[PDB]
């Protein structure tokens, strides 16, 4: 089993995202992972990319968030979105879920899923 280049890059981006403790990484997003019971992997990732897309769209032009550490955050959030095109697809998947998580914790939850997924190439 060859190691997936896509997963590799996604993990690099997630590691970069979760090492920087920026001001606005404490803002909350919908905890889509709470709503992923009997849900496909593709849908879970689409739900996550949708939430992430909404976040970087709304907080790219955010005065409160602004001035260089926020630039890297938005940069890497957009990267993550692109990195997920192959897993999530170019799709929007809204959820009714009310549960909120900090962006930090949301990204940590996604990193865990991806790194578990990546470790399959060690089989």
């Amino acid at each position: 089993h060859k190691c997936d280049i896509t997963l590799q890059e996604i993990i690099k981006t997630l590691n970069s995202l979760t090492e920087q403790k920026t001001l606005c990484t404490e803002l909350t997003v919908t905890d889509i992972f709470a709503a992923s019971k009997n849900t496909t992997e593709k849908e879970t990732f689409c739900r996550a990319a949708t939430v992430l897309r909404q976040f970087y769209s709304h907080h790219e032009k955010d005065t409160r968030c602004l001035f260089h550490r926020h630039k890297q955050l938005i940069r890497f959030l957009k990267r993550l979105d692109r990195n997920l095109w192959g897993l999530a697809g170019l799709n929007s998947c809204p959820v009714k879920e009310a549960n909120q998580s900090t962006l930090e914790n949301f990204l940590e939850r996604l990193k865990t899923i991806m790194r578990e997924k990546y470790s399959k190439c060690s089989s």
Partner: protein, 157 residues
């Protein structure tokens, strides 16, 4: 190379003067980072057209693909940088370049709701029947993300 790393950073940051100094001093215009980005990817992504132009004039690879198959054209389409799209296309960018996800620049512009970019891509010969990993065309993707204006434009073709 240290000069390569400095040029990548200068291109990302939009430091026009520094870009030109580094290139004159020995930086490779096609410097690669560990994710496969070149100075041209970063300048297109961060919307620094003057840097895009300087790089292309001095031999940057207009069709360089990062680790996931994305070209500077994918990136300009993604962030909605219309002039950069136009400049890349004139410099010979593959209008139908595909990444590992099966995504073309027209897919990107269609999903992210960039009508003018869609128009320029179509005129440059973008393939409206191109399918991604999941069998979807730019028109499918536009319609599913609620960009009806773009989806109508594409569905006529």
């Amino acid at each position: 190379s240290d000069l390569g790393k400095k040029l990548l950073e200068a291109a990302r940051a939009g430091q026009d003067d520094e870009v030109r100094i580094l290139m004159a001093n020995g930086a490779d215009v096609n410097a690669l980072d560990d994710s496969g980005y070149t100075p041209l990817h970063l300048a297109a992504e961060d919307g620094h057209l003057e840097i895009v132009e300087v790089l292309l004039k001095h031999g940057a690879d207009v069709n360089a693909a990062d680790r996931l198959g994305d070209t500077p054209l994918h990136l300009a389409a993604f962030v909605g940088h219309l002039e950069i799209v136009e400049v890349l296309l004139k410099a010979g960018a593959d209008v139908n370049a595909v990444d590992l996800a099966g995504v073309t620049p027209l897919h990107v512009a269609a999903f992210y709701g960039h009508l003018e970019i869609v128009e320029v891509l179509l005129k440059a010969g973008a393939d409206v029947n191109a399918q991604d990993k999941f069998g979807k065309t730019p028109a499918d993707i536009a319609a599913d993300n609620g960009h009806e204006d773009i989806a109508e434009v594409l569905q006529k073709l």
